[PDB]
Amino acid sequence: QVQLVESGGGVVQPGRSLRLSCAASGFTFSSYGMHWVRQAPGKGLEWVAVIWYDGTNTYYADSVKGRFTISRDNSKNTLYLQMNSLRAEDTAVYYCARDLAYRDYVWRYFDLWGRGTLVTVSGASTKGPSVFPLAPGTAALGCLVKDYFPEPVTVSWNSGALTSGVHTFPAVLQSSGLYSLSSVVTVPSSSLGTQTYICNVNHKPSNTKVDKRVEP
């Protein structure tokens, strides 16, 4: 099966380095030009670098020139991105992508993409959230998932038994360098006395699992 799978993402302090890998399967890797493309959270796509099929030339976006190096090992079907002197503005999902052209140095389009891997550059350290209730013919209630790093968190209600009327918002990045998000649910006002509401928060980077009962 034709695919690209990135690895090596994570958190990094400003000025430090990280090396991403991308394992290619299902096609003659040594016959294609390869790229890295990134997407900062909530922003558009930005091309990062390209390497010719035989590795004999490379080009970079001015934003990463001198700090990043794209390379490949055709014997292992693997593409790399060495990222040095990282800055907060390099925080993004990084995708490896195949160039459409076959054995052609002219690079133009991305015909196959990986799944992406998140790289977060910040002075903050990995930390699980604190979960606070948002206490309540429609009533609204929720949970405030505050002060975690890095993204993402997942939230469910009543262990997945409550899905209708749930809204889990995108997180915001606070001036402290930690994220905060809310998750809410609207229910009939009469259900406040008959049904129990618990928010279930997971933050995989810190192995945090929280169950918070939200009472009127």
């Binding site: 558009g44 796509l45 390209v50 001015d62 992406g116 995108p170 809410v184």
Partner: protein, 214 residues
Amino acid sequence: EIVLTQSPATLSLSPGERATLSCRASQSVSTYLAWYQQKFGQAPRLLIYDASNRATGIPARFSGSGSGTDFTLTISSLEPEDFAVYYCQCRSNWPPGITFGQGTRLEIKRTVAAPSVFIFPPSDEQLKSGTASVVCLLNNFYPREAKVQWKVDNALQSGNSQESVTEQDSKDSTYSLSSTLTLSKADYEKHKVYACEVTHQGLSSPVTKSFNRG
């Protein structure tokens, strides 16, 4: 360097209707232009390349046209998963690079719906830690444009709130918005009335929700 400009930033359409997305280049790129689709939370995928060539496996409902600086992506009959972000893309030579447009998002057009507003005080558990977060929820409204203003003891707040908006709901085509006002516990305890004032096309007059305490 080429610049690609996509218009409109948001296209409001109905399912089944024809979508026409535009991409303008700053200077000619001949027919060397591609379109990508990005569904929320997923990687982009190539739809069209060389202005009008459909990529392998892409359904016939997607078609591209144009040359020089004026390009169009047409989606003949929209499916639910097509209400996504679309990017155009080309090559630049000075300096060598790949340029993307800023994207056009497709949303489902529906009737105007005013938000239902709710305010939440900070929990006693959070106050025990030295900070107070007050949250305001604007639920299930349309269109996406909405304004939240925080007022504490009748004074307009500035610089101490952050907000975010959900993706358009798949069932009712509305948006929701959450705004958080952050104060120190000491500052929260110095004030009594906390209010969030909401303005939106569906409200003839701003709606305020408030509570007393702190």
